[PDB]
């Protein structure tokens, strides 16, 4: 190196070029994958991460762990990106994608070191991934009769399998049934915003409940609220977007008078406007009144005098769920409160839930929404419970959209590895080594399951390989029995699209990482 | 190792002379520290007694700006002289950073400082004006730049006219 009188790029620019760059990229990907290695399978653990502010997060989800990591390596960020991709499109398998991509890169690292051209490796990954995706599609088990009970069992088993890796795995049956019941009530779009999730401190996990309606926390009651009755046996609910308070008619409104009689008339007119709104609400027959905008103390006392329930500053999502459950409409004007815009729930009640007051709208027969009330001993406990419930809900939604399943526990991975190896025996040989490396990398999942469970991965992998060779496409790792078993008969079921997306994303990430030969880092701005 | 309730008692009242002398010296350093801290960190991130008692004095209704310099400083000094000739009501002045003893970062990367004081508070803390003003712009450019923010204020006698309260009385 010699000092040019005028340098080409900006001073401080760092450039890494050649095989060492790609080897370093593979090593960085391995380092990132190691951070979520132990959070796989029913014997997986949790990670605690403390941010700069001192707040701590505890999660078994791979995508959350990767996001909370401040990854700055350009090649390593692809793993976080594909984890986020798997979370967004599917919601489960955010650890499998990273493990598979890192295993692909580790398997092809020795061939990269030998000087093999990366285009060949990319082509081999594309071919192997296409073959594996086709195999998954054409061996996935589906039932073409769509009975309600069989679909219920399939969804419950899928939710149980998705949930049997978190701290709620002990109550996985209860939560799986709750998830299936919650999902079935969504009408056609299965919006996540239509499934409320409320976290209340104090209580066992078994105390968590799913309400066939809506529920939200009490919102800053004014004076005179305690005099209102707190239970109705057939209430009519007025869903409103109205500020019921004494206030200026408009921000720019100005009143100009020159007579004390006009002054008194103006005061009485403001009072009459408020009382006219209140009377219009009351004469509609409604007994429970909810509003986005604040409800003043005067209106609260007025409703108390009429044996009515009022609640102001209700959040937008809560009112949307209440409208979808009771079956009304959010009215910004109270001039036409017809009977067809009023909600109707069987029972409304305010109850004490773990040191907090919640309003319950139960008994809705045609409700298209639901609310989860999760109990726990700590904030992070509740957050991890919510994450697990979200994973289960996403899995159940995908299974509803497409009910094709493959036995889990690495059975599908081992079958794909066997098929890809057998294909690799019948090609000239340059691509054969790469396809065999891909097939061997497909074995990371059962090996990681055995390692996390504390088994001897070598013997279990040998038994699985022999079993798959001699027949049986649904044989995977049996964690409880220290051995292998038919996972399909053990109801270890996951949707086929989960593995399809995992393989596709891992292959794309590996191809992108390998394709790069040189990196440039411009100086800090 | 006991007697945590020391109750120094007569001590502080018997040695109050040295304590008050040290307190006075520390407070004297404290006004300087408070004055200098208004520039560093507050705007840098985004004799000294003469400066202190010059800032403390004079009317709050007159805008007074000071310049921090080290030995294009000459061009900005010339522009400042031109503005002083154009704005006699203002009291333009400059002072070295080493006299104030500011931080090393201010000395190394904040040599051009346009500090404006109005009634003891900083209404303008233009620091390192090289980028947004230039290196060789004239006095009119600086005047326009400062007047765009509404900070600077909006015949000639022979030489002088000024010199009991009995002005003139012809009453018998």
């Amino acid at each position: 190196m010699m000092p040019t009188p005028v340098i080409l790029l900006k001073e401080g620019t760092d450039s890494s070029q050649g095989i060492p760059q790609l080897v370093s990229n593979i090593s960085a990907c391995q380092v990132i994958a190691e951070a979520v290695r132990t959070t796989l399978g029913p014997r997986g653990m949790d990670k605690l991460i403390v941010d700069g502010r001192g707040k701590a997060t505890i999660s078994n989800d791979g995508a959350t762990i990767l996001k909370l990591l401040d990854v700055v390596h350009p090649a390593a960020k692809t793993l976080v990106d594909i984890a986020k991709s798997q979370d967004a499109e599917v919601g489960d398998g955010t650890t499998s994608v990273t493990l598979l991509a890192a295993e692909f890169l580790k398997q092809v690292k020795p061939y990269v070191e030998e000087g093999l051209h990366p285009q060949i490796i990319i082509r081999a990954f594309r071919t192997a991934t296409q073959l594996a995706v086709n195999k998954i599609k054409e061996i996935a088990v589906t039932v073409k009769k769509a009975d309600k009970v069989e679909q219920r069992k399939l969804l419950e088993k899928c939710a149980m399998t998705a949930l049997s890796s978190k701290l709620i795995s002990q109550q996985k049956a209860f939560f799986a049934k709750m998830v299936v019941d919650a999902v079935m009530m969504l009408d056609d779009l299965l919006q996540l915003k239509m499934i409320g999730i409320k976290k209340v401190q104090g209580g066992a996990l078994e105390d968590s409940q799913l309400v066939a309606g809506v529920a939200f926390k009490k919102t800053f009651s004014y004076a005179g609220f305690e005099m209102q009755p707190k239970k109705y046996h057939n209430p009519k609910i007025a869903l409103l977007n109205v500020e019921l308070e004494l206030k200026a008619e408009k921000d720019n409104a100005e009143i100009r008078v020159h007579t004390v009689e006009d002054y008194q008339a103006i005061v009485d007119a403001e009072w009459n406007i408020l009382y006219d709104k209140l009377e219009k609400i009351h004469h509609s027959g409604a007994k429970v009144v909810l509003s986005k905008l604040p409800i003043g103390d005067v209106a609260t006392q007025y409703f108390a005098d009429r044996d009515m329930f009022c609640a102001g500053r209700v959040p937008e999502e809560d009112l949307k769920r209440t409208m979808m459950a009771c079956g009304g409409s959010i009215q910004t004007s109270v001039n036409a409160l017809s009977a067809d815009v009023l909600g109707r729930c069987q029972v409304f009640e305010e109850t004490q839930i773990g040191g907090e007051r919640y309003n319950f709208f139960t008994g809705c027969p045609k409700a298209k929404t639901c609310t989860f009330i999760l109990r726990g001993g700590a904030e992070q406990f509740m957050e991890e419970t919510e994450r697990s419930l979200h994973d289960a809900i996403m899995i159940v939604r995908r299974a509803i959209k497409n009910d094709s399943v493959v036995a889990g526990g690495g059975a599908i991975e081992m079958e794909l590895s066997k098929y890809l190896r057998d294909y690799s025996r019948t090609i000239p040989g340059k691509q054969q080594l790469l396809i065999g490396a891909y097939a061997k990398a497909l074995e990371i999942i059962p090996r990681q399951l055995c390692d996390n469970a504390g088994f001897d991965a070598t013997n279990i992998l040998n038994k699985l390989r022999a079993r798959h060779a001699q027949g049986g496409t649904w044989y995977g790792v049996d964690i409880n029995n220290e051995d292998i078993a038919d996972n399909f008969e053990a109801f270890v079921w996951e949707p086929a699209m989960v593995r399809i997306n995992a393989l596709t994303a891992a292959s794309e990430a590996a191809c992108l990482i390998v394709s790069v030969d040189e990196t440039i880092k411009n100086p800090r701005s | 190792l006991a007697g945590e309730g020391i109750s120094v008692n007569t001590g502080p009242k018997g040695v109050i002379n040295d304590w008050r002398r040290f307190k006075q010296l520390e407070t004297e350093q404290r006004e300087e520290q408070c004055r200098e801290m208004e520039r560093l960190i507050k705007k840098l991130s985004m004799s000294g007694e003469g400066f202190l008692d010059m800032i403390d004095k004079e009317q709050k209704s007159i805008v007074i700006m000071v310049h921090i310099y080290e030995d294009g400083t000459e061009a900005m000094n010339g522009c400042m002289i031109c503005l002083a000739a154009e704005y006699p009501a203002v009291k333009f002045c400059k002072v070295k950073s080493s006299v104030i003893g500011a931080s090393s970062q201010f000395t190394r990367n904040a040599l051009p400082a346009l500090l404006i004081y109005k009634g003891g508070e900083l209404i303008g803390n233009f620091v390192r004006v090289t980028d947004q003003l230039g290196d060789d712009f004239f006095a009119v450019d600086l005047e326009a730049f400062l007047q765009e923010f509404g900070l600077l204020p909006e015949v000639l006698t022979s030489v002088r006219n000024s010199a009991s309260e009995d002005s003139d009385l012809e009453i018998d």
Binding site: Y111, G115, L433 | -
Partner: protein, 536 residues
């Protein structure tokens, strides 16, 4: 920090194993680019402007500043290989690092390190046995061509590789010159008795092999002759200066008349010693000690060459070659001071030769024994230093070939054959040691891979073809002659290296395998590291 309460950092489990493997890989990759004929030399700067252009692995690893102790372990491994063999210094480091990397990869699969170590030991033993039984060529059926080819193979990748046709001949002649037998009749070749002198100037072709000995010394005085046509060499181990009385003796004068006589005798003692030495007819006087002006004048008047401050090893070699006797003192068993002609070494001619503005002593054609010396000429000092290092490597290789009369095919043929044989053999030994031996066989393939990748060629295809050839040789008894098929990096195709004249001493491969296996075993034992903070 914690319950252990030790003032130092600690690493446990896979972390320390990964650190050790990374250090080994770093050391391997430092010198991996300098292996094989298509390898390239390296340029080292010693922080004060000193430049050391070199290709030897031992020199590279010794000159570097190494902090991680596994990296050190590899460095002294290379140094040990250099001291005990003289060749294969880069190969042993590369093999050891690859062995460690694959052993750690096995360990990460929950394979216990004891099984990996046992498999490595068994694989090394079987590889040594297979090499000694199947992959050796006896040099008694070749003669001098085997020595020439071994020297040329050693010289490949060095700054004298292209000039091998001449350098190998010079090295073979020099080694054969210093050959002598000892007790029990075994002929041993004392390399490092061939003095190597570096002097820039003319091209490499003008490097000359002296049929005698070359001294990096000049005559003491300008008056004495600089050429003797019949040398009578007398080697002395004592200085010839004015005689100074010992520490325990003092001269106390009470009669003034004795001082002049004492002062005269003080130099007459040395004068008498020099006259005794010269009376026997000696023409060349070499001494390890200094010589002052009066003794130089005496030698000049006698018309005899005198050299002072001669190195002790050079003096010993001259005495052995010319038949002279080292005399640390002039004192016989009769209590007198005498010098006999029986201690006079004889040489055909001694010349004060001039080499590139400097002068040196050439002792040509010593009798009663034949000695050799090499003077290397190059563009500058760095080139001469690299020439000397490569020359020493070639001399060591020729020594090994002449001592042990067995050679092995070069160009990675031995590595490929060993990989095939060990991969086949691993299936009949244990359960996890099977995997250990398979990993050993795979790790042995790094040498041909590095040789191929250094030539910017398709390493995968070349190694696959080599493995196919060796497998066909092993499984087919009638095709047993394919064991010699190695790598031809000039054309990038397999080639019969035994026919092509690419040979290496068997001891090189055997010692490399043993040392690499032991180093890998030593490193693999570590599962925890305590790094105490320095007291300062």
């Amino acid at each position: 920090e914690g319950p252990l309460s030790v003032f130092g950092d600690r690493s446990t489990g896979e972390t320390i194993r990964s650190q050790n493997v990374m250090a080994a890989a770093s050391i391997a990759n430092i010198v991996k680019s300098s292996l094989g004929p298509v390898g390239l030399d390296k340029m080292l700067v010693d922080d004060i402007g000193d430049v050391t252009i070199t290709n030897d692995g031992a020199t590279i690893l010794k000159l570097l500043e190494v902090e991680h102790p596994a990296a050190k372990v590899l460095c002294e491994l290379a140094d040990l290989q250099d001291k005990e063999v003289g060749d294969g210094t880069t190969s042993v480091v590369i093999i050891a690092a690859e062995l460690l990397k694959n052993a750690d990869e096995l360990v990460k699969q929950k394979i216990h390190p004891t099984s990996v170590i046992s498999g490595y030991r068994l694989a090394c033993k079987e590889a040594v046995r297979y090499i000694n039984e199947n992959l050796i060529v006896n040099t008694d059926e070749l003669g001098r061509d085997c020595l020439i080819n071994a020297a040329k193979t050693s010289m490949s990748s060095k700054i004298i590789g292209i000039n091998g046709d001449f350098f190998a001949n010079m090295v073979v002649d020099a080694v054969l010159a210093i050959k002598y037998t000892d007790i029990r009749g075994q002929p041993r070749y004392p390399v490092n008795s061939v003095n190597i002198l570096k002097a820039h100037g003319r091209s490499q072709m003008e490097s000359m092999l002296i049929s005698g000995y070359a001294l990096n010394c000049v005559v003491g005085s300008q008056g004495m002759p600089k050429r003797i046509v019949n040398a009578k060499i007398a080697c002395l181990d004592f200085s010839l200066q004015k005689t100074k009385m010992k520490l325990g003796v003092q001269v106390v004068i009470t009669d003034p008349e004795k001082l002049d006589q004492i002062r005269q005798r003080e130099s007459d003692i040395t004068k008498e010693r020099i006259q005794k030495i010269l009376a026997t007819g000696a023409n060349v006087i070499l001494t390890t000690g200094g010589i002052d002006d009066m003794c130089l004048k005496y030698f000049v008047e006698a018309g005899a060459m005198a050299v002072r401050r001669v190195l002790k090893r050079d003096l010993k070699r001259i005495a052995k070659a010319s038949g002279a006797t080292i005399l640390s003192t002039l004192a016989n068993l009769e209590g007198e001071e005498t010098f006999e002609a029986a201690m006079l070494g004889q040489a055909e001619e001694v010349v004060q030769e001039r080499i590139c503005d400097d002068e040196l002593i050439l002792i040509k054609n010593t009798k009663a024994r034949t000695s050799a010396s090499i003077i290397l000429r190059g563009a500058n000092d760095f080139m001469c230093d690299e020439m000397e290092r490569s020359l020493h490597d070639a001399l060591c290789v020729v020594k090994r070939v002449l001592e042990s009369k067995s050679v092995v095919p070069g160009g990675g043929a031995v590595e490929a054959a060993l990989s095939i044989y060990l991969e086949n053999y691993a299936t009949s030994m244990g359960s996890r040691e099977q995997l250990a031996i398979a990993e050993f066989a795979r790790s042995l393939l790094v040498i041909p891979n590095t040789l191929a990748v250094n030539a910017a060629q398709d390493s995968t295809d070349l190694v696959a073809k080599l493995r196919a050839f060796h497998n066909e040789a092993q499984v087919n008894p009638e095709r047993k002659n394919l064991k010699w098929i190695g790598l031809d990096l000039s054309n990038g195709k397999p080639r019969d290296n035994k026919q092509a004249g690419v040979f290496e001493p068997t001891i090189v491969k055997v010692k490399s395998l043993k040392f690499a296996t032991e180093a890998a075993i030593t490193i693999l034992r570590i599962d925890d590291l305590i790094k105490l903070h320095p007291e300062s």
